[PDB]
Amino acid sequence: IVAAVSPAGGDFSDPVTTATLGITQVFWGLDKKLAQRKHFPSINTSVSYSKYTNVLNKFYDSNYPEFPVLRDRMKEILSNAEELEQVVQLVGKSALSDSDKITLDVATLIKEDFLQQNGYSTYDAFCPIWKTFDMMRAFISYHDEAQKAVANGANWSKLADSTGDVKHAVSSSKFFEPSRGEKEVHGEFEKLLSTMQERFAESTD
Amino acid sequence: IVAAVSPAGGDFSDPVTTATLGITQVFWGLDKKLAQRKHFPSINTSVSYSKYTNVLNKFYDSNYPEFPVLRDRMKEILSNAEELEQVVQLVGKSALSDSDKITLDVATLIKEDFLQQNGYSTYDAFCPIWKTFDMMRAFISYHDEAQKAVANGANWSKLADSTGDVKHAVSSSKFFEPSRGEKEVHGEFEKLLSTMQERFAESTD
Amino acid sequence: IVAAVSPAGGDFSDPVTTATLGITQVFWGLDKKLAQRKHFPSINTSVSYSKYTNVLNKFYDSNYPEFPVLRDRMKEILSNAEELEQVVQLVGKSALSDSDKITLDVATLIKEDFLQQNGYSTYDAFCPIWKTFDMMRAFISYHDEAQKAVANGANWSKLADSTGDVKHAVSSSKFFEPSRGEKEVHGEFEKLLSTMQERFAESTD
Amino acid sequence: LTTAEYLAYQTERHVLTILTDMSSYADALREVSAAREEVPGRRGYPGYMYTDLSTIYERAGRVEGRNGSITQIPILTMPNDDITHPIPDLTGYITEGQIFVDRQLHNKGIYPPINVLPSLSRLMKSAIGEGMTRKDHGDVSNQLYAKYAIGKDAAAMKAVVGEEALSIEDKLSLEFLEKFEKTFITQGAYEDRTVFESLDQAWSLLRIYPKEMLNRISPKILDEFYDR
Amino acid sequence: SGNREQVFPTRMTLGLMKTKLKGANQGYSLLKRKSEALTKRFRDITKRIDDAKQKMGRVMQTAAFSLAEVSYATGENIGYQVQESVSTARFKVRARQENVSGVYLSQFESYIDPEINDFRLTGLGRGGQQVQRAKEIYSRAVETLVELASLQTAFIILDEVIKVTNRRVNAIEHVIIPRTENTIAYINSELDELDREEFYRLKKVQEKKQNETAKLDAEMKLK
Amino acid sequence: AEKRTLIAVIADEDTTTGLLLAGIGQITPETQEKNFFVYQEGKTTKEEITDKFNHFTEERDDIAILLINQHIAENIRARVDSFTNAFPAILEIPSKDHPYDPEKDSVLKRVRKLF
Numbered sequence A, B, C: 001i002v003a004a005v006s007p008a009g010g011d012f013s014d015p016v017t018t019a020t021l022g023i024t025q026v027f028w029g030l031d032k033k034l035a036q037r038k039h040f041p042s043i044n045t046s047v048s049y050s051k052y053t054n055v056l057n058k059f060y061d062s063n064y065p066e067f068p069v070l071r072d073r074m075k076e077i078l079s080n081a082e083e084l085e086q087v088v089q090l091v092g093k094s095a096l097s098d099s100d101k102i103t104l105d106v107a108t109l110i111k112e113d114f115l116q117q118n119g120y121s122t123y124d125a126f127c128p129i130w131k132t133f134d135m136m137r138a139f140i141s142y143h144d145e146a147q148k149a150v151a152n153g154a155n156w157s158k159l160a161d162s163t164g165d166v167k168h169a170v171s172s173s174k175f176f177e178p179s180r181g182e183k184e185v186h187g188e189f190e191k192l193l194s195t196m197q198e199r200f201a202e203s204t205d
Numbered sequence D: 001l002t003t004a005e006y007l008a009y010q011t012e013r014h015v016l017t018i019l020t021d022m023s024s025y026a027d028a029l030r031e032v033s034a035a036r037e038e039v040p041g042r043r044g045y046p047g048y049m050y051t052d053l054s055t056i057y058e059r060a061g062r063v064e065g066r067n068g069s070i071t072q073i074p075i076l077t078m079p080n081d082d083i084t085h086p087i088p089d090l091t092g093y094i095t096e097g098q099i100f101v102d103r104q105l106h107n108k109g110i111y112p113p114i115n116v117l118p119s120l121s122r123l124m125k126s127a128i129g130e131g132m133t134r135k136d137h138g139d140v141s142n143q144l145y146a147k148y149a150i151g152k153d154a155a156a157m158k159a160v161v162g163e164e165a166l167s168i169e170d171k172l173s174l175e176f177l178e179k180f181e182k183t184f185i186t187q188g189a190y191e192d193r194t195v196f197e198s199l200d201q202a203w204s205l206l207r208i209y210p211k212e213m214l215n216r217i218s219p220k221i222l223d224e225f226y227d228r
Numbered sequence E: 001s002g003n004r005e006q007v008f009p010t011r012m013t014l015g016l017m018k019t020k021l022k023g024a025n026q027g028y029s030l031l032k033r034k035s036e037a038l039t040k041r042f043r044d045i046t047k048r049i050d051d052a053k054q055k056m057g058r059v060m061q062t063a064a065f066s067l068a069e070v071s072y073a074t075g076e077n078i079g080y081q082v083q084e085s086v087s088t089a090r091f092k093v094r095a096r097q098e099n100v101s102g103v104y105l106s107q108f109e110s111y112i113d114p115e116i117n118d119f120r121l122t123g124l125g126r127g128g129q130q131v132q133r134a135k136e137i138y139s140r141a142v143e144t145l146v147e148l149a150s151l152q153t154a155f156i157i158l159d160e161v162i163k164v165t166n167r168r169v170n171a172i173e174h175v176i177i178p179r180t181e182n183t184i185a186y187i188n189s190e191l192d193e194l195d196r197e198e199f200y201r202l203k204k205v206q207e208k209k210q211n212e213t214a215k216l217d218a219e220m221k222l223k
Numbered sequence F: 001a002e003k004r005t006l007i008a009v010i011a012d013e014d015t016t017t018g019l020l021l022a023g024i025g026q027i028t029p030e031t032q033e034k035n036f037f038v039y040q041e042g043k044t045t046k047e048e049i050t051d052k053f054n055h056f057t058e059e060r061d062d063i064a065i066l067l068i069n070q071h072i073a074e075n076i077r078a079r080v081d082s083f084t085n086a087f088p089a090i091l092e093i094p095s096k097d098h099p100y101d102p103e104k105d106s107v108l109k110r111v112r113k114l115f
Helices: A015-021 A032-036 A057-063 A067-088 A098-113 A129-151 A156-162 A164-175 A182-204 B015-020 B032-036 B057-063 B067-091 B098-113 B129-152 B156-162 B164-175 B182-203 C015-023 C032-036 C057-063 C067-090 C098-115 C129-151 C156-162 C164-175 C182-204 D002-010 D022-035 D049-057 D086-094 D103-107 D137-157 D168-184 D195-206 D219-225 E011-074 E126-216 F015-020 F046-059 F076-082 F106-114
Strands: D015-019 D069-074
Touching: A057 A067, A067 A098, A067 A129, A067 D103, A098 A129, A098 A156, A098 A164, A129 A156, A129 A164, A129 A182, A156 A164, A164 A182, B057 B067, B067 B098, B067 B129, B067 E126, B098 B129, B098 B156, B098 B164, B129 B156, B129 B164, B129 B182, B156 B164, B164 B182, C057 C067, C067 C098, C067 C129, C098 C129, C098 C156, C098 C164, C129 C156, C129 C164, C129 C182, C156 C164, C156 C182, C164 C182, D002 D015, D002 D069, D022 D049, D022 D086, D049 D069, D049 D086, D137 D168, D137 D195, D137 E011, D168 D195, E011 E126, E011 F015, E011 F106, E126 F015, E126 F106, F046 F076, F076 F106
Parallel strands: D015 D069
Antiparallel strands: none
């Protein structure tokens, strides 16, 4: 089943959605804010859920071993950064530590380039599973490199200025035409990740 | 048909009011908060409306040609006052510019001396249309002269006490007895306007 | 009828608790915070009103004449200290006057050794009305002697350090055994008050 | 519950009865109520919701004479994540506490996503002491809750006063909160942790702080459990 | 009753405004604790600036008497000679930069000019010692000026944060609370009551219909 | 802002300038104006001092501290007016030729008022 639920005026107080939530293993709930921003698709990555994350591990361990770990990391980044945003929108970004700035900025990068998906262009109309996994790897490794680099001396403003090229590369990785096949798209992502790691190693010093 | 609607609990959403609205071209929505402080006739300028201003322009241009312009100016400065008070009750008069201060002061003048009407005293029991139009000219001219003097350089904080006699003359202009006759009252109002202009020219030297 | 009310979610607004608060004359008002601090009996003296204080004058004036004014003084100093804790939070403790510091110290002594009753030990499991009245006299006299000897004498700190033994005596007054006999306990309290008066007279010099 | 009453009173064995998703049971009780043409009470649930919830919950507890005992853990889904809903409200009004599972922690990947700060067991203090579990269990629980609250609010302030302006207590509390949420609360789905072993982890977690900063724990327990 | 928010009562609105109340409440608490941190730093700044003021009494007197001893050695007030001696004496104030308790307080970290002693070497030997004492007093002055700059900038920030917390607890939270109080307790309960009235009327109609069917039959059955 | 240097202009005593210019001073060679204008020790009207204070604390863009002799207890109102910001000139009140740092100092007055 894929049972669309028109949310009506209410968000989830409508008894049809409440009665459905107790049955459906997967619930890609709408996000009003992402719709008002015209951020498509506009599903809410904080109240949606899939009771199928753990059963699929039998499939992930055979094909994409790191997929569940990467998904958990992605969720952790998004949730920590939504917590952080709920405060910074109330106070301001001046007091944020460098790690806090990285979490917030990588969350913005994710929410704008991974989660967001046009769905109409020839690229990204249907993002296959291997391309999605490789972009998960790229974004998570970018966050890991930023966090590790600022665990060392390098302050993050200069680091962002110096690795804007790497940030743009991981942001435009979505543009990779999936019709090129995994054989070469995965090669592109391997090249991207290697250049990412070497650039962050260079800019650390 | 003029018909008070007396909603239960003072709620505008009370169904007799909602049904009455949508069929009544005019809506003099009274506010309990203004009537508590004996601010007669306690009308709420924010939400009241009259769909009849569009058809009355013929009468106005026939009799009091600049009445609609003055009404628009008065409602504009009143709305500016409402938003400024919304700002101030959270921020304070410090952040206000000088034009904001003069808008607030003139709107307080209006809400205490023009919109207010004792309804039982001999001088405001019946404010005929010509006296009302004359006081619209007087109050709007006071606001315009004060705004101009602030723009021309004189800070309003210094101006307030220097021209306080003019502001008090405007405030006491509501005491002009309506039975004194159109000629007498209009002559007094022309005198008040001339005194206003000369004193505001003198005080800005 | 000592009838407890436990609303659905601790709201204390549902009609049952409103009706009981309206009808029940005395509302002893337990509190969770006072219980977590282990301040038994955990009575929140701020809200715990009692409208039986007036009809009880016919009993007090018969055999405990000074009780009503005494509890009025104790309650007013307690409320003054509750208010002044906010001032201590706002500005440093030194900014408080000597009289204010007296009030804070005496009310802390109150909260620690008059309201706070062990209830499990043999000495204060049952605090009879005469012992409670005599303790009330001791505490209020302590506040009064400190207040007078500071308003007409030296700084509060010097007296407090000089008469710390008196404060210890009134604090340990909670330990007097009710089983010792009403006459013996009253004589002991009179001895404590006399030694009090002479010690404050000595430290006044 | 009838099977549990049998096993626990007519025989003698204890039993920990589980009632999964009592919210769905309430949903079915709505259908029964509307079948009888009864008017709906609050929120659509029948007005006697409380009676037919109590007649389930209160069929549990130890018994004088019979050695057995029914322990209920009635799991229920928050309808829209609000305590004010009739079902969570009534269940917390009949039961002896609450053990939250929190969306916020579950989105971080934690398992189980137990939210300790609101969860409480009213009569926990009965099941804690020298005879049952170790003697330090109560004070370990108290101190863990206190330090977790400190960690949560100091994690809130990290974004307000910066990390460097936090008192050393709050810095240690952030470190403790990270290690806590990631190693103590975070438990493998199939990892059985004996209460003694879980207390050992709790101690290995609280010895972040110096003995003086563990004000909540009684000194007689610190002087024999802090170092080992 | 109280300050309404003039909002349209519905369950989505109740949930939205309940979350908004939670946000404003946590914001009030958070800004209150930020205000206590900043006012702690501010009280430290005030006590240090008072101490620096009594230093500008005592130590400034000591440096002034260093100048007096130099004048006594020279036998006359060397102030006339020192007047217009150099364009930029051996000292300068660097651009302030710091972040104290989450606020970018600008404490001036003044440093000596590289062209040291641009106006020294005049008169007797006490001139150099007087120059050194003046440089020490000027370091004290840079410290006092930095403390005053903090006591102004952090004063403004503490005033803004304190009035924001007060505005929250007075207007914002105490208008959001009546808004939710309305939206649920008055209106949503009233609407549920109306719906239950309508349902009970339906039940009454259905019951009377079934009863009359019951009496028309059971009477055809009676006879 | 940019770097600058201190000044001391308060007509009570200019001997403070003599005692301080040995280590710290300020003149404008580009503008041909001694930024450390003397106080004349009471030999000038307050109008010139006010004009110099306005030029230094409201016309100069380069920001630094500024000093003032015992006249700081005399011009307290103007000091409160110009002390609205720590820049361009965070004022100060050295003792100068007599002990003149009482509770009457404007900065100390503000500290006490907020105390």
